[PDB]
Amino acid sequence: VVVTQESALTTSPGETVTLTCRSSTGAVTTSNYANWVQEKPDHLFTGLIGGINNRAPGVPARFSGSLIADKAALTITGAQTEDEAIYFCALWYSNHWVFGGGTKLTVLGQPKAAPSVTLFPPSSEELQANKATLVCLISDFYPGAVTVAWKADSSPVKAGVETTTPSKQSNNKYAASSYLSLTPEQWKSHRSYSCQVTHEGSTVEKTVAPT
Amino acid sequence: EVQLQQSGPELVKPGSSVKISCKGSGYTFTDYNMEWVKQSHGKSLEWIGVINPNNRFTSYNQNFRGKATLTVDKSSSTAYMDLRSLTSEDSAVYFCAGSRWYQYDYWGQGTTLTVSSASTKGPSVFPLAPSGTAALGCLVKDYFPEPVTVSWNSGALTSGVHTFPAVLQSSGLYSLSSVVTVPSSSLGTQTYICNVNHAPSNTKVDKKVEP
């Protein structure tokens, strides 16, 4: 049995957004007792809807449940910035719950901003430890999505890269960090390494050289 | 307030057992069944089973028979789930939840379980030296297990500080970075020290970061 949800939706404050929940067995019925639960950062789950379109205790009136066609639905009217979260549905099948895959709901509560990027070369201390890490600091962007690409001189490098999932700054914009691990040999043997950050509003490339 | 307070994070070797507790307060414990849920890979949710505090009746997801055992102690308002014969497949965040009338009303805070035979490894710390405002930071390399915490100037510095989530690397070790945006005019006359704490290895490092 498989429960299917949209993977991502985007809305804005004050808008109406509708999430849906499909059952692979056929039509969702009120006897599937569709539940909706909300996941926020730091593993914070909150019940929203269950039973038959019943709101959980303390849930704002703007959340409501219904059936739409053969699917269960969660409607958020007048969406708020706080409604950004992952929404999971769960359906009951006589003797067990089955969860959908979740919908990532973005609420654009901020003017879009392309990041400020600072690229740090490996420190001489780390090179003396026979290691090399380039650090690409990606700050003050919105929404919380960027693409990062690394180059050795003018050629792409994919191996040895790890990027953080965007994290919220205290000003509600996002930051992220990307790391390229190299040997000291590799670092000294190219003219330059670059970190290229792509955001909807701008692409910026920063470059560092061992000299 | 309604609280479902779960026991703390667990790091255990393959083949061991763990018992997770979930204590309810601030509601009528016997008005709710206690559901248990596993979240793997930080994404997908599976229902493990449910127990009724009034009569110890239980229902299980057949996939968890012989893995999970649900018990309850009405008098202390605590539900428990024992997980046995642990493998890396059991590494996950586990949740208890209070349900009534086919509705998940209340959620615990989650219990992180890591099944691993890896040994503790303390971090190496390197400066991210600065070269309007300037960015500087500290790079915390190749440690295990989480967490590392970072302050600046023993907590006296917080404006412009962002400590990133760790990355999990191919090696199985973690790395993270902490950065501060400061006035350029303060470079060379203000001391900036990152204080890196890795409690699992009993390690603390202070690194003064200089231009």
Author numbering:
A (entry chain B): 22 to 232
B (entry chain A): 25 to 155, 162 to 241
Which statements did the authors publish about this structure?
First, we determined the crystal structure of Fab 2C7 alone by molecular replacement (MR). The space group was P1 and there were two copies of the Fab in the asymmetric unit (heavy chains A/C and light chains B/D). There was no electron density (2mFo-DFc) for several loops in the constant region of the heavy chain, including residues 155–160 in both copies A and C, and 216–220 in chain C. A cartoon representation of the Fab structure is shown in Figure 4A. Another loop containing residues 216 to 220 was disordered in one of the heavy chains (C) in the structure of the complex but ordered in that of the Fab alone.
In previous studies, murine monoclonal antibody (mAb) 2C7 was raised against gonococcal lipooligosaccharide (LOS). mAb 2C7 elicits complement-dependent bactericidal activity against gonococci, and its glycan epitope is expressed by almost every clinical isolate. Furthermore, we identified a peptide, cyclic peptide 2 (CP2) that mimicked the 2C7 LOS epitope, elicited bactericidal antibodies in mice, and actively protected in a mouse vaginal colonization model. 2C7 recognizes an LOS epitope that comprises lactose from heptose (Hep) II; lactose from HepI or GlcNAc may also contribute to the 2C7 epitope.
